[PDB]
Design a protein around this nucleic acid. Sequence first.
RNA 1: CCACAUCCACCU
Lengths: 143, 284, 88, 91, 328, 1096
Amino acid sequence: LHDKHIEIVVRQMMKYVEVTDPGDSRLLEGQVLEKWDVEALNERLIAEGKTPVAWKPLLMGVTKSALSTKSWLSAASFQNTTHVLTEAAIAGKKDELIGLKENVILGRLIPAGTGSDFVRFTQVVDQKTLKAIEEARKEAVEA
Amino acid sequence: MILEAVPVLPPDLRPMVQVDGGRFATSDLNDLYRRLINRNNRLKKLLAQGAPEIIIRNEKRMLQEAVDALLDNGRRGAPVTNPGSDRPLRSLTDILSGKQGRFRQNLLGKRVDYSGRSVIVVGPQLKLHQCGLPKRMALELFKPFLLKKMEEKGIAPNVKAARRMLERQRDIKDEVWDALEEVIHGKVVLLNRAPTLHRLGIQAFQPVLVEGQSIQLHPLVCEAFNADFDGDQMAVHVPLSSFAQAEARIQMLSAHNLLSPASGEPLAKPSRDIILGLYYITQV
Amino acid sequence: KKEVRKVRIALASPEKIRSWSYGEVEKPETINYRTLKPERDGLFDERIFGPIKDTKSIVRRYRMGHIELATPAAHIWFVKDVPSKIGT
Amino acid sequence: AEPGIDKLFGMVDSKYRLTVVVAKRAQQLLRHGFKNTVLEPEERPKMQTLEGLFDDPNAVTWAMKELLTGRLVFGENLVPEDRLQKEMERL
Amino acid sequence: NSLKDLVYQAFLRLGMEKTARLLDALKYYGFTFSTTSGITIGIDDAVIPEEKKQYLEEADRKLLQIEQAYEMGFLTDRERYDQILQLWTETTEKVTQAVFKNFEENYPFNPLYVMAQSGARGNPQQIRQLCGLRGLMQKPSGETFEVPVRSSFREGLTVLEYFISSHGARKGGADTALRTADSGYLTRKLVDVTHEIVVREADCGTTNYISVPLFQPDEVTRSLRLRKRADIEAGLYGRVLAREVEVLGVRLEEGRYLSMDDVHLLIKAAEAGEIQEVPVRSPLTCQTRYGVCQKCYGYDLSMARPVSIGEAVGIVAAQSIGEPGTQL
Amino acid sequence: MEIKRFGRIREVIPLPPLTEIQVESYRRALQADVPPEKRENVGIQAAFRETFPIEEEDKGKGGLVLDFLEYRLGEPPFPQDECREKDLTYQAPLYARLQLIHKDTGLIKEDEVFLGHIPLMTEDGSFIINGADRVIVSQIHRSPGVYFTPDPARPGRYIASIIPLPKRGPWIDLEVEPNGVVSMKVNKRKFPLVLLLRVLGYDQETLARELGAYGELVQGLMDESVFAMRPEEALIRLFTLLRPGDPPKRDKAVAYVYGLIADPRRYDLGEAGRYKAEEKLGIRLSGRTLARFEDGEFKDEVFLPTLRYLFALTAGVPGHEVDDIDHLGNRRIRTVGELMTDQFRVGLARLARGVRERMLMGSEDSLTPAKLVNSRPLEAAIREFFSRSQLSQFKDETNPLSSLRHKRRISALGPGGLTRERAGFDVRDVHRTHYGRICPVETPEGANIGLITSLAAYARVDELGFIRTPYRRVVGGVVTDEVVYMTATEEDRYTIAQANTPLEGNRIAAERVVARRKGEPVIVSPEEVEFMDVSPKQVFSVNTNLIPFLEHDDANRALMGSNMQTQAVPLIRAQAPVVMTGLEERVVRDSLAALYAEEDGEVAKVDGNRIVVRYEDGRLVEYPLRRFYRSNQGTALDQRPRVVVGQRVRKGDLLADGPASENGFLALGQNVLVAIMPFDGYNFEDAIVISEELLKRDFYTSIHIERYEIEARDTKLGPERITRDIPHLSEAALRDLDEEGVVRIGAEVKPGDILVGRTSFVKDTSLRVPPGEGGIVVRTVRLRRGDPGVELKPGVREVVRVYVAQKRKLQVGDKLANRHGNKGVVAKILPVEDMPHLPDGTPVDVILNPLGVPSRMNLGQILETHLGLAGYFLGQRYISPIFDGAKEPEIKELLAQAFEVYFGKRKGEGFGVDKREVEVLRRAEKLGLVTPGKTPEEQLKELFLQGKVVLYDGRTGEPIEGPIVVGQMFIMKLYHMVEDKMHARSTGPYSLITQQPLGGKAQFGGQRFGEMEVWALEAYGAAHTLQEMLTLKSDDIEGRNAAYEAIIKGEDVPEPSVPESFRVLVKELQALALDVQTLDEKDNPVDIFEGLASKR
RNA sequence: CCACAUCCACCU
Ligand SMILES: [Mg+2]
Ligand SMILES: [Zn+2]
């Protein structure tokens, strides 16, 4: 078995940090490392105010990492509907339709594979129609 | 955060169905709603008539317990159906949660229209990008396509005539078989093994019409699936849209998947009998 | 016509509950055995959930009812969860 | 397999883009009908019992053999999308 | 193994259609020649080497010695059990070696030996059980029986030996029936936790990497030795070099995917003693928002070419990890 | 055709009746045959005498004395034939003689009161409940008594457990806590046992010289001396320690409920709980349990011995006296009789409560017949036990062996409070005491592994769930013919030899003899041997004993071969295996499927449906035959006559064959010529290549009968009439529907053809042949409201059932297997011309892939193939025991004789050795198979000794390089249900809650796509495939309808919409206080519904 | 109509 898959799972295992020096939020709370990176970049450079959000990485099991996610649909459908739905009901959780499980739930196009925005739309025209429309383009460029 | 008015589920989401001889089978939702309605009506009447404080308090506790039982059953006591059947009533949470709940039946798409299943047999004469499909199940699976094809020619006047022609097998004709062969010239079907452990448990194939009841499978894919020929069965699905047909024929065709995704080791490697023959021929 | 982008989950006010429902159920009478038609204003009332005869019957799949309790009650989820949200 | 999957993969950056291109070409070939092909004169699919592969037995093979030649172009935004997308559905 | 290497090389150097045609031709000719060659299994094909006979006698003699060694008080119960287990597990390996040596020397074209040498069917342990002896049998408590099974399936097992082997049969059945469920639960956990990873990317400006080692840090208390070829291949094949490295007069440019030939060259160079760690990109250091980039992910796929942008690598990763668990 | 047997063992005793367990258990439960005056009381009479005799001293109208005198039952309402034809119960009414006495004058005795109908066991050992027949399987659990278990945490001490029954009763647990606490927890609360001991009438001095004399742990109880000086008020404080709130002045409320009858178990005297008591400790246990109530005070016969024994084990060492939880001597079997008795006494207790309540309400006294006892509770309990219990399960009548095995199966599971599915890993493994009592191989693979098993062939439950194994007595060096049945506890004290040890008749012929000291294989001297194994057959089950060469097989393949022997369908012309073990005749005789002559006599008349036989006494008896009886699983049960008119018969002689018997021999399968070689690809991994010879002559063919049923019922719109005429259209197809509504017998029916014409309110709702297959109508039965003795579901005016029979033949879909677990599926049916054939004209029938032999470990099939090759030319059958079969030299000599006959026949016509044979022999010489320097004659003879002969390809004519092993194998066709049939649908029924399609009887129903398949599908780049297969092809009703219309129109499918499952989820969320709505790119709600959510 | 419960099997 190759190491790429284990590395993917390990990276998803510890994608969470908890801050020690509070910034604009509480201190002993843990959430996504990448969100804290964005917050630090906004606070120090993008906006004025040098408030170091001094964090430490937190390593949690596979189940805890899966349960504590921004999107409530996957967490609700994964392990325990009651607690996840209660938490997502306390605060209005606008589930952004990122991730494949949510799109499977809603039945819409999967963000991965063919549905990726990189290849989602790709206009295709044969030689003669392309030539006609390009002739229209260059005749729009007068003289 | 506490609720004053309790919502009521639409009736078809909790239907009462005749079973036999006038008896009604009903979901526990109807029973819980009936109990809550009766208790609320009793509380309204009691508050209207008089105020015996202890009875009113007992009725308040009883109504609160009824509401809690409707919302979720088992968290406090275990309200049950009519005595004689000690099966706890199914509440909204039981519908939602559980190994068999609304989330674990809509996330999965538990049922498909254009699908079948049958026992698999070895397909040694087949090429690696082909699978043997019994002609009766192939005709049934491609029924609308067959109807359109025979409407294109003069087999039937209208689609209703074609459907009534195909509804009884005593009307089978060689022209129908030729039309069916013409329909599936470029189509592909997805073969699946019941435990789908990895990505290769679903594989596209070009169907070839065969006579029999079993599905002919290429020997070289006997390892991609964990499928021997000791009586195991496999399922077949038919994608409809040309978009899905192109997807299956390009990126799920068995001819394009020769190496593992877990490692570089091939899965289309020669199997036991081929290895034995090649070892015997190439021995000194 | 617009595409779905986000799914929001939140608490529902009693005003929201009353806005959802079309009338209130008062009788605990599901359906009479002799008259296969709905009995009264109960859980299967004709005029509270839509026509049962072929709008289609699909309206009855989506129309919701409501019960106006004379006494307030709290959701069991917010009182029996391991972190008691009302309790915290 | 199918004719020249290797060069089909070679001429595209990703396989998924190739799938999108071939499927969009197939959809065009369907809803226009098979008239606006760039392989009409001599090189066409050949059916076995007759020449039934002239009209429409399976369009994915049409689109693939059509893309095997150099008369097709594909890109993220090569032509004004609004005009052709409004002419796509209203005719 | 030769056929697998042949198929891999043909896929690498020819493509898709040619590899499939080669596989079809190989299958057809293998069927034809296996049919015409006439491989059959009879009871006389399970040849019992004569030397193993005296082997048992020797072991028996040693057994008796250990027995009297226990009656003089020189050994404890644990010591005696360990000695018996070691003696029997050594004579079992000796009998297996003798059986295979006899097959090599006397009957090169024996169906059992031919199937064992090739990758068709069977293992040396199974061939020993057929022709030699299935000595050691595990107790339901988890330990191993003191008394072995002298007979084999070529001969007739005693009633007690069969009753003892039923223990292992039941253990295997129950272990399968439960470990399958445990592996399925693990697979579901991994799929759900990892389902969000998809390769959507412009090449992230990651000036970070991981240094994959090439030497085992501890096989003895204090010693360094080269890792196994399989481990190095599973750690390096299909990766992207973090920075340019020149090891044997060849300039491996930065950003070059490591093919199998590059892995072999690096292994040979490490054997020569030039480098000890390979700096390569890894998903662990990728800076992508939700997923990993094409460079930080790598080069291994069903095909050989680098990963296409938009592939759900998380679910295939979880499936790849969880699939062997059911067969573990 | 001769029969040659190989094993040299003198079976001192024959096999016991293989179904005697259930039959004897039920005959002991119901004592109808014996007069009621007889001493026999255990069973239903025990329950009556225990629970029924209610007494009331002073409660309103006191003096109520309802006593039991006798019970009787002697007439079933109907014979079992129409009890199966009509869905009745083969039961008998139970009558009881009751009498009422009050404190005043009065003898109100009612001789007959009906109280429920109890089912009656059939001759074979099954019951008929509602038409079909069921079997009640035996249960295994913890035997009641006194056990000792090491503490889970503390290693120096342990606990004692006295276990009565039922659960709502005592469960005495004694623990020794190191602070000097003798804890006794009865139900949920711990208690110092010293107070109870003081209540029992024991003072400190007798406790000292009777318990503390030897052990120093008496200080752990004697330390509590401050509070042990009360004779009687100790009972009052003991009751006060309990929390019922009752006044302390209740001397015999709870202190006595643990007395004689109520709480303590009434385990059968001597063995059920006394043997677990008297043998384990003490000397005897007088009475049923510990109690005295003749003087108000209390006595014990368990507590003092248990304390003494526990202190002896924890302080000293009487022996290794700790009870194993899985030791089979401590486990007990509740057979059908015990379960029925328990349910009957539960019903009797309910009836007792009812009659007590009625007496409390009732005023006068002359009301004994009706106003006291009502049959409803007991009858309801009995019916519930016989219908909806877990151990009362559908009979498996695939073949006589299947029925017998199902009848002699033992289950660890049961009501639910004993053993349960999800966690049973510790008890699934076999035990050292299962040797000779439980088959270690018969367990079924799957979730139900280890929990469900079958007892040994020689195993026998004696009277109380204790399996006994036979053993021959050995005195000194002579083996005595005396045979004793021993329990596990009794067995654990002697040294037991093995049946394979050399014997000189009545003398041990070996110096070193293998034996089992206590489940441990040891080697001893003959003088130290006390008992001998009767036979190897006592170690395995009946089904496992049918495998000839079990000694050369792996445990797993032997397991599955025994399992698949159960599910082999009976064939039209089935024949006994060439190689047998010797239990086939016993299996067919003990399973009541064939007919045997009860007495010496001469046959008078023989027909296809009855046989009239006149015995020696001059009495003539007619035996009818179930000519074509549909089984439970849909197979055919036939009795074929095997005697001729005017033929003398002996006692026990065969008269008619069973469903799967050739001539008094178990014959479920065929004997075919098998060649163990790999064909082209058609036997690749486990597939099987078969000849068309097996099909040209009907050789693998079975009759399958399907029973359709349709009922006309009274609806509010109007009763439905079973009438011939069809309302709207079908009149051309009405020709087959000959009579009024019912199709004529003997008319072939295809799928989609009318079977029964029923008209509803008029609308055509007629039973048609479902899609798939249909055969020949053989029988039709009609039940109407004009009931002779039949009862129907209320609201249903009539019902009609049609049996359709078809003659299934072997094809590609079917699967075949042998007794050694070599499963296979027929992959190709080759013509006769192109298959491998011998040097003679005879071709092989089946070709098997050799690669399945070494990967697994099944060499028994190779020995069977060699012996069948010998017997094919010798024309004789062989019987070989499982562990005393034929030695290899014997098989070699038989093969030498067979080759002599074969090649002599070859040379008779004047033929030598073919050139192809010459080149094959030289090639084999290069391979070392045959010694060089010998002529082709003896070279070919030596090759034949190996079991391999030269084969010719047939397709090319050139011989197959190298010799090929060929022989005769017993290959049988397994049970073949709809599993092979293609459940392929394109459009069918949809569910109500969600619109995901699932059909069944009407249409096959959709195939599952689960989540693992979804994960695989999205592991690829396929997104539109998943999108259409979750919405377009699964749930979106408008999407699927539009796609169907577009495909009919030959246009591309439309874009899918939101699936109805998500709408269901949204509405279920809105049912709670939740609030979910889909949003646009901005915070603008988007209605998933068109306009239906919006009001008006 | 197919709901749910219980049981027996088959393929991993
Ligand atoms: Mg299989
Ligand atoms: Zn990166």
